[model samples]
Target: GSQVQTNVRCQGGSCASVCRREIGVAAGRCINGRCVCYRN
Candidate 1:
């Protein structure tokens, strides 16, 4: 879990039709109770 805006869910990839669209999207995961938005 990162303290700042960490990139987790979107680390390997994203949950969308394409990767380009998922870019800059807030879909990151929460490792350790932290909220990691899409910016991985």
Candidate 2:
């Protein structure tokens, strides 16, 4: 399993740029006012 969890204030914010920098992947979704990024 290759996944990473990150927090992104859900106040009209995007997670792609931030998540990509951290995980090297461009996949993330906002859940419970937070961004959960996954790679692989």
Candidate 3:
């Protein structure tokens, strides 16, 4: 398994949709102004 944490500067509210689209369904929590993405 591998995990990728990216800070998607959403500029407004959140980066859920962006992370999900870029990182896939494996996208995890969005904390500290960052998106936690993962995959197996």
Candidate 4:
């Protein structure tokens, strides 16, 4: 399984941009003000 985790703040576009720089990250979503990484 591929799992990516980050402790960065979820600022919408800011979160996505960080995810883009990482590997195996399909998308980034802000869930309840927290940043989450997904590969779905």
Best by TM-score: 2
Q: Could you say which candidate leads in lDDT? A: 2
User: Candidate 2, overall lDDT?
Assistant: 0.71
Candidate 1 error regions (>4 Å): 1-24
The better-scoring model by lDDT among 1 and 4 is: 4
What does candidate 1's lDDT look like per residue over 2-30, in tens digits? Answer: 32343334434434323224355635444
Clashing pairs for model 3 are none
Candidate numbers, best TM-score first, in rank order: 2, 4, 3, 1
Residue range with the least summed lDDT across 10 consecutive positions in model 1: 11-20
Better of 1 and 2 by TM-score: 2
Scored against the true structure, residue 4 in model 1 reaches a CA lDDT of 39
Tell me the lDDT of model 3 at 27. 48
> In candidate 4, what are the lDDT values of residues 1-40, reduced to their tens digit?
3446667676455456667766455477665566667677
Ranking by lDDT: 2, 4, 3, 1
Q: How accurate locally, in lDDT, is each candidate? A: 0.41, 0.71, 0.60, 0.63
* TM-score of candidate 2 to 2 decimals: 0.60
lDDT of model 1 at residue 15?
40
RMSD values for the candidates in order, in angstroms, are 7.4, 2.5, 3.8, 3.4
lDDT tens string, model 3, 1-40?
3556776653345555666776776345555666666564
Total clashing pairs in model 3: 0
Off by over 4 Å in 4: 1-4, 11-14, 22-26
